[PDB]
Symmetry: C5
Subunit: 307 residues, 5 copies
Amino acid sequence: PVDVSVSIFINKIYGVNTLEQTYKVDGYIVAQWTGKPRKTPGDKPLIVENTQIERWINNGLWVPALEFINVVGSPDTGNKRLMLFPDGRVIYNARFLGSFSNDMDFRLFPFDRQQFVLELEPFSYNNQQLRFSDIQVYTENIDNEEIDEWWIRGKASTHISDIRYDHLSSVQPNQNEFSRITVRIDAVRNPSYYLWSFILPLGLIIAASWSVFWLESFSERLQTSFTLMLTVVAYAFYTSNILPRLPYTTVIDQMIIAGYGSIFAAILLIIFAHHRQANGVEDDLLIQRCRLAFPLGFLAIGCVLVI
Amino acid sequence: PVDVSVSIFINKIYGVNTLEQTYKVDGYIVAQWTGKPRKTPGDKPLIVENTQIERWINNGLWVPALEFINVVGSPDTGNKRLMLFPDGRVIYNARFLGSFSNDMDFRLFPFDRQQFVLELEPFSYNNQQLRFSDIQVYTENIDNEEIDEWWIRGKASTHISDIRYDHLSSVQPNQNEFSRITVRIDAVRNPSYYLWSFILPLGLIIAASWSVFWLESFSERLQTSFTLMLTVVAYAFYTSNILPRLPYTTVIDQMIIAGYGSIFAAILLIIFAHHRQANGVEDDLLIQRCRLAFPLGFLAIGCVLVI
Amino acid sequence: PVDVSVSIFINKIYGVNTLEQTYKVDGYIVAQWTGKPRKTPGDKPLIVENTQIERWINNGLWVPALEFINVVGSPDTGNKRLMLFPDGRVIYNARFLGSFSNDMDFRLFPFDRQQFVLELEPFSYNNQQLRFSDIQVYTENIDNEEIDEWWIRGKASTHISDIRYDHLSSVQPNQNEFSRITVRIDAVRNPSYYLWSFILPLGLIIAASWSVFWLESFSERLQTSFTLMLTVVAYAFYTSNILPRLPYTTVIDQMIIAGYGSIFAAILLIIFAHHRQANGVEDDLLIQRCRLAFPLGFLAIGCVLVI
Amino acid sequence: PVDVSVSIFINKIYGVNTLEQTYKVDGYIVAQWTGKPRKTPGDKPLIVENTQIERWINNGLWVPALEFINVVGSPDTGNKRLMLFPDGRVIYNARFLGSFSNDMDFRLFPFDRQQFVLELEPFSYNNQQLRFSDIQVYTENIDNEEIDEWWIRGKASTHISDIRYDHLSSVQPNQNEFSRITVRIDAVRNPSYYLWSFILPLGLIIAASWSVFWLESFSERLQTSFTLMLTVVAYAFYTSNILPRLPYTTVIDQMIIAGYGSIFAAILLIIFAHHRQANGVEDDLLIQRCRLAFPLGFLAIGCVLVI
Amino acid sequence: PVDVSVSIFINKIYGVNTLEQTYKVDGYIVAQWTGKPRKTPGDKPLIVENTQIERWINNGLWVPALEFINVVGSPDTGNKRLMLFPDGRVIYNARFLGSFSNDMDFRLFPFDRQQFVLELEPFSYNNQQLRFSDIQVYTENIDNEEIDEWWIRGKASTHISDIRYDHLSSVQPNQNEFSRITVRIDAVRNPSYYLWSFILPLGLIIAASWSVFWLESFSERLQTSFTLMLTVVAYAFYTSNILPRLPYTTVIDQMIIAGYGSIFAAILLIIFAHHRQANGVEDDLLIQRCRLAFPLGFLAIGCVLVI
């Protein structure tokens, strides 16, 4: 009933792939388990680097394949080493860089929370069980991440449960429960850039759109609308090119629709004000003085987007 | 005439390449077939991991190469294992990530169907036959697809047919029929994002184009048209940059031309309105009152685009 | 002087790189040639799959290297198999996918003609000759290129010629002539998409530009032109991002320049209309009525663009 | 306590990945260390190239794995050679190209300060220490950066420090201190292109925005403001697409937000001038003559962005 | 002091990386050198293809590793063959595809002169020299043609000089001079595409920019200019997106600044014309008649930019 200790050193997470739901993790991994003792050179432990390891297997060294369950494609294995002890126990060490997969919601784009997860599990062993799992990191929050991508409000989160896999259990009846280490790391999106540089300009554009009501004539009002209309389309484009592509509406992406709407609603009022009259051409007394009433109407509906 | 069991675990479909007609499939695959019984260590089945497998072949172990017929390029093979049973039967297991090809129509872009398909067939064996095929997916539709991209409808279509391959049969007369597994999965595109953020703004922009007939003057009418023209071209760009590039007209793309036409037709009326007159000056009294006759004409053309 | 029959199964191409002049080809290749007989297990021919093939070479099996002359970089060799016959003849089979290069003229962009080419020739053999060559495409022209950019044309083209290579021919005097299979498949560009969505709106835009002459004033005429100018600049951008990048002027690219001229010519006329008078301020009575004389002037130069 | 001399020849930096904080370094690396003396063919030193090196290891030649700690994924090892000297000493030479990572502040974008760094450390040895470190570079500052992208202020550097690694350490009590070479090179972004072609055009536009106050009418003033609004949205787009993507506000990114504001502030004054009056419609006599008082207000706040 | 002849067949140059200063070269390379005579099968020369080569080295065949000094990462080695002669001399042939680097000045962007370079040098041998070097190019110009991106001013140059490498000269005292082939090919920029399709439209816009002086009113003049400003920003974006990214100001990039200035300068005159008066509102009679004096002022500054 083989015991396996596991420790995973995390060096770097990088590259969220918003569409494919994919991120890259570089780091090391450690497995420790005790086997039959052997004579080593001297009596100090014997060290085996890279290319040499595969040879020891051909002479009867059992070395379990540890698969990353949730990695997308075999990861980049850097240097790898074995530490064989004269008393038997064996240490497998390897550096990796791999593209891992997990479910993640991006609907709250400028203010995200995400959880990056690793799932390690032996490739073909059910009564070889994973003893304990450990990780690390070295950072400081809240501090220097007005420089950084986002804050890692969060920490370790170890699991290591057992998985059933109820399919073709008759291949080996009664035994198909595999030991799976699961690690998860929480993180929040530093909104600084998307607020200071995206949320703000869009609102001003939407806000400046309302100043159309202070134009004295009607032709002035209506013609200006199409320039404001064009202004939203441009900002919608600048939004879409730079922001990460997604198959749903982000908070920013909804704000873009809010601009498209606010200007189109004015379009209807500007026209309906002209032809809801007592004669033929009269801008309805009290109607064109929604100058500070359209901003109130827009802000009122923009508080139901929150809850 | 060797019998071969096959089981295919499907983990993930992701990243369709609309231009090249290509999608990626990550998962596992299993092959089982019984051969001459042999002595294993103890009497437990023997487990052979990764590199050791290629060695076992050099001692005369026949292991059929199973090629993916519809894969584009050799796939990324992760971990692989053999299970040699003392009673003869052998279970080949490997994790695979590969880019597969299938016919895909994207003309109805925001409302696709589609069928993701696998085709497995031994690389050099016609008597060796595929016994039975199974597929395993652990997803839920419709449910979390507001965070994903696709809705899946079908869920397990399996075939296992036979192929003729009638070329150069005199090399071996009478025998050239191969056993081919066929897996097919139906799926539908989540129209949500392209409606709320692409179909929606485009219609409003096209709709606002019609309000030009409510401009009083003719210089206003004709001059304003050119501003609307620019608005469509801009939105065509924003459409073209973010939407997946294709060599045919999508539904949006047809709606995009619909705008281009409405504006050029409006241009024609606006000018024809001015010089289809009685004497000096008269803008044809009723023709500038197609204010809600141009909207009706467009929706009529937008209902024959559907069927 | 060994004879070698070769047949090339072509599966798909699909991904043209217009700048690098490059297309991808996936398919199979077969080589058959008769050698000294041998004893096979039983008397059935012996099958060798992939890694085992390289083992047979180390025991003196000569397997000629067939190089793709016009492939850019080593192609992806999928599965490969040998067929060793008891009567001597040997069949080499392999699946390939590679990016090939050929000269391709794209000057007539929306209406291209191309020739996709494979060139196979042994890597180091002058008196080992290719017996006869075969090509298996199956597709059905005119038909499905409604969905794929191209259109298949004339199909199979085989040569099997001799090459001189007169440089360092003194390295091996009197013998430097190689047997080269040459495959060529002609193709035409499906213009449907670029017409309905690029050529057509462009014509509408250029046509609408001429309508400036029906604007009454001169300040109106000149001012509106600058909006038309910006409209043309926008369409080049929308064109340039989506269309395939090239180092020469395509047909579309020329049509784009026509707008730049028509507007700049109008700018000059509209201004010259104002200051070609008898008295201070009189728009030359006939010249501003080139309203349907710019439409005629444009079309005359666009039929000398044809020949 | 094995001594190892190290010299790292740097051939090329380049291709900074501003988002991933990543740069590539091409060059050679040399390891020299004296071992048990013996006999070479003749007495000239023995040279072992590439594929041959891997053979020598299996007969007991210890060659330590030198890992690039800050490389992202195993780097590309070009050619490698061993020089075994008859007096014992051995020279390991290999050409490498790998993607290295380091912390990079880009908040000062057009005037960045970065430090590209190598961190070398043995993969599995605690009393085998790095003797001395050398680097070779051959550059000139301030001079060729007319063309080169990077001004260098420092003249390389070398550390060769000690690392604790206080984890896992009871596996080997008393011994867990590793030797790490650190090489660091200072460099700056060179403002020429971003000033002459990005900073300058932005400033001119913001200045021209203020000339809106010199329009006689109010409709002229307010309508034109929306045109300036549209222009800024365009320029933010042109900046964002071409400039390197970052998760924070660069100097340019800050300058962009100021433009968005100046127009919205002008819009408000233009309006407040109109309705901060003695009657109902009088542009407040002094306030619309902030024509050269908005420029003064802009220049004063743009000096607090510096400090 | 072994003599080695080298001949390099060049098949294709393609894919300039303007930022990284990098180009791709596909072709073959040939090495010829005379050694101890050996007995071959029969007396014909023996041919060794690919995988078989590395085996011959392990039996004492010395084959020098030839490194491309300015190649960025180890290149893709296609097929390789040995021709061992009974009289001793040995011919190494291999097809290579690799990414090479060189310094490239792009400041005169649309009209460059460039020099593509290969640099070959043995990896670990100082008294084995390159006898004579030959390369085969077949590049005729002016003619090729009809147009392209570069033209060819020659065929090549062939140094084959001696290198010092003065760092660590005591590794082997008194002998550290290596033989390095240097091949260089000159090329000139085919400007055709960038003139007709980029330079020409800019001039029309810049020329049309001056037509603002023929606008009658001042509100006409000043308001219209803000539209012209937008036109340049649009064109800079379209320029920068399609044109190759660079770290310095191209000729085009300066022409873009020339527009930015001419339009901003017009703004200044247009306003100064209004307030350099005798009464209060009189447009200074001669100054607004710089309509064809600003074209003259602009053309003069574009001729000292030349020298």
